[model samples]
Target: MKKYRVQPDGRFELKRFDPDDTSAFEGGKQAALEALAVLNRRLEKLQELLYAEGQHKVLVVLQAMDAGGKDGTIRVVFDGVNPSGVRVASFGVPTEQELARDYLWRVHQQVPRKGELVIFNRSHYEDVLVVRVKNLVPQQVWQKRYRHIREFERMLADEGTTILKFFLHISKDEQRQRLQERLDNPEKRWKFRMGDLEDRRLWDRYQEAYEAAIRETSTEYAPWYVIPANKNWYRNWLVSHILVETLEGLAMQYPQP
Candidate 1:
């Protein structure tokens, strides 16, 4: 996972990472599936300890292009965790009410409480990614948010939240296949959106925006991992493996009464 982490240094480049990478795991798909099963069990026990101790908070932020598997990663990586301690917060287009406040207001409300692990599916990073690519705000406005986000995450870490942000790195070709599959399959057709095509057209712009965001905001307190997402099994395994490693590092123990 260290290989995938965007170093806090300012030299990060999105093009350097491969969307199909699976080198973190030694074996192929079937073996990786078996390994993920074990990881699932470990994650389940870790969640139990985390919730039982009631002394730590975890914030997981996941950002990706369309059909990049944010929802699928949540489903697979967190397969058997107790939902009481694990929650997913997905940010879409802000409502009229949400737009009234600073962008982080709605996000701040969803931070993890002690003994909880909250996952942000398409989070505040969008303020930089979509906003920059679509020109929703002036260059001056969106660029400033990189600083604001770093500070916001810094404050969260100061208050004892362990932050982990992941960018689901998928190739444009992968996304094209996913969108085509979504259209071809009846059940998946419901997930398709015409607007997604527009977003796909600005792929390079989004990549550049993501690179800038990750380089500027990744911190020791709130680090970012560029996960290879073209391969679902490998993606699921890596994310789950990292989660288990991080939770285990906390060394939480159950409270004795």
Candidate 2:
């Protein structure tokens, strides 16, 4: 596997996705395992540093369509992490009460305290993605949120939250297949959702909204990466690589105090 970079144009392109072949798939899985192992080690170091530093937080935001592998990625990549210092929040449809509050209210309450890693299975991007695509909110309401989101993230960055956003880009056809598999496979049936088909029908619109959201909101402080995700193994590998690079760049280390 080769190093993948978020492009100069703010798009994420993965080296492993080049000319997808059986050999590439096999090779990528092995490489992914190795990369994840390396990341786990770095996370261990990060945990110690966070505890000692006691001033910073790492917040990973994961946004994707249904069957885009958020839960699975969390399970595999985060399996060995120290649970005491790690936390996860899974956001779904906002309840009526939640809707009554500010869009960020429910999410902001769940952010990790200093010295921890908080993983968001689905996050605040919904205001721009689903809410925009489905017309859950008026255009005027969601359009203004682009700047609101950038400023919210800017504040987080200034306050010592290392924020990373991932938009897993998988084609509509691929998503249909996965959704069917979830229904047809007995073991995966539990993951199926009645609303999934409705969401699929809106795929193109969702993609358009996503592109605009990325272009409008990706900033120097909290950059967004659109990870190619038709291939699950490759996607996992790219995520682990990005994470390791981020933690390493932070110069995280063992506790000193």
Candidate 3:
């Protein structure tokens, strides 16, 4: 799993990552599915202890291209975790009220409190990513945010939030297949967005933006793991494995009765 981690040197390249690689797990799809079950169960217990201790906060930040399985990962990997202690904050187009404030304003409100776990479906990193790729802001302006994000996350960590950032790395070809499946299957057609095609057309640009964001902000305090997501089973299993390991490392215990 450490192989996937972006080191703090800020020199990692996205081209080196293989979306189809599943070497982290040692098994076939069925074996990976079974392993996921065990991981999910352990996550349930660990989440309970996290809440019971009421002393730590966990924030899992997930970023990915279209059809990269962010929702699927949440559904499968976090299965059975107590909802009261878990929350998902999905950042989309900024509202008037949200845009009225600084970029981190809306995000700061969603940070997890002690004894909670919060997942950012798409996070503040988007300010640097989409905003840069789409030219929503000037390069000079958006370029400064890399420092802002690092400092912001540093404050969160210094204040006791354990941050785990995962970039669901998927190939352009894999995204095309997934998007086409959404169009082919009636049940999934509604999930398709026309804008996704436009984004696909700008694949290289988005990749550049993602690479820059991951390399710049990945640090000792808030590291980024680039999860190979072309294989759904492997992606789910690996993410669950990493999540469980992070929580276990926290060593939380239930309060004395």
Q: What are the lDDT scores of the predictions, listed in order?
A: 0.92, 0.77, 0.92
Model 1, residue 106: what's the lDDT?
94
Assess candidate 2 and give its TM-score to the true structure.
0.87
Query: What digit string (tens of lDDT, one per residue) describes model 1 on residues 1-257?
Result: 78988889999988899998888899899999999999999999999999999989999999999999998999998888898999999999899999999999999999999999999998899889888998989999998999999999999999989999999899999999999998999988998888998888899999999999999999889999999999999999999988889988999999999
Model 1 Cα shift for residue 186 (angstroms): 1.6
Cα error, candidate 2, residue 108 (Å): 1.1
Across 132-213, the per-residue lDDT of candidate 2 in tens digits comes to 8888789989999988888998988998999888877677778888898889999999888788888788877877887777
State the displacement of the C-alpha of residue 205, model 3, in Å, after optimal TM-score superposition.
Answer: 0.4
Sort by TM-score, top down from the best: 1, 3, 2
lDDT of 3 by residue, 22-124 (tens): 9888888999999999999999999999999999999999999989999998888888889999999999889999999999999999999999999999999
Scored against the true structure, residue 204 in model 3 reaches a CA lDDT of 92
Candidate 3 residue-wise lDDT at 124? 97
Once fitted onto the true fold, the runs of candidate 3 whose alpha carbons sit more than 4 angstroms away are none
TM-score of each: 0.98, 0.87, 0.97
Residue 232 error for model 1, in Å? 0.4
